[PDB]
Symmetry: C4
Subunit: 81 residues, 4 copies
């Protein structure tokens, strides 16, 4: 599966990672990695991968759990300030 | 190769895994993994990967063996109830 | 890079593998694997990956070496009779 | 993410690798690898991957650092003369 974005529907911890409400998560099934991007990173991604989709803008913990089940993704927090 | 679905043509064990007739298998060549999805998972996949194809709806064990040969996929059963 | 086919331009050994002239090689950069497919496998691939391209139908050893350089692919022979 | 090209905006060392100004870097998120291609390799890539994009033709070190952050890519120099 291509990379995609989701946006958290509320503030929660999923897979040990705290996410604010409205956190944009970049999900990469090929790399088995999802992480919370800052705005500049979100925008960068859309330069290099212009057709990336926001497939769910109200992602609950149950939605993220489906990503774990289907794509075996390891969720992470931010990797920059 | 992109991810794709197949549907089993009959009830059988393939690669040590029991599949009912009509089992929808999500096949991911990139992750070298195929597994039997439940309906809610099948539907989830079509939200995040809207263009996924059902490339064979009468997949026999011989068809799954081609998937092993070409894509080196490890077949699994369900991962939820 | 997506998977693609090449066809050998002559009979040769490349990366320790013998290929007949006209051997169809399935190349998978994501899996770092290329191998010589039999006709039934070639046809199977076109069912599950209908848009796969034959990007070079006169591939010399030098062409395969570019595949090694760019995609780090391990070349193999047939995996069925 | 699909493979893509960038072109360096100036001469610099990034991740321990020297790049001339105007160096074309082939970036493969799936393989977590980017490297400086020679012209013949650049052209080869466009034969096998005809739709590859030059997503940034003035890539600074900060741009390459985003590639590291988002795609976990290991940068390399040339692999041929
Ligand atoms: Na946004
Ligand atoms: Na179905
Ligand atoms: Na042919
Ligand atoms: Na150029």
């Amino acid at each position: 599966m291509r990379d995609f974005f989701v946006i958290t529907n509320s503030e929660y911890t999923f897979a040990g990672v705290h996410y604010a409400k409205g956190a944009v998560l970049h999900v990469s099934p090929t790399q088995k990695r999802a992480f919370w991007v800052i705005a500049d990173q979100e925008n960068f991604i859309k330069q290099v991968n212009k057709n990336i989709e926001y497939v769910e803008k109200n992602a609950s913990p149950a939605f993220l759990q489906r990503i774990v089940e289907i794509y075996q993704v390891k969720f992470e927090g931010k990797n920059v300030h």
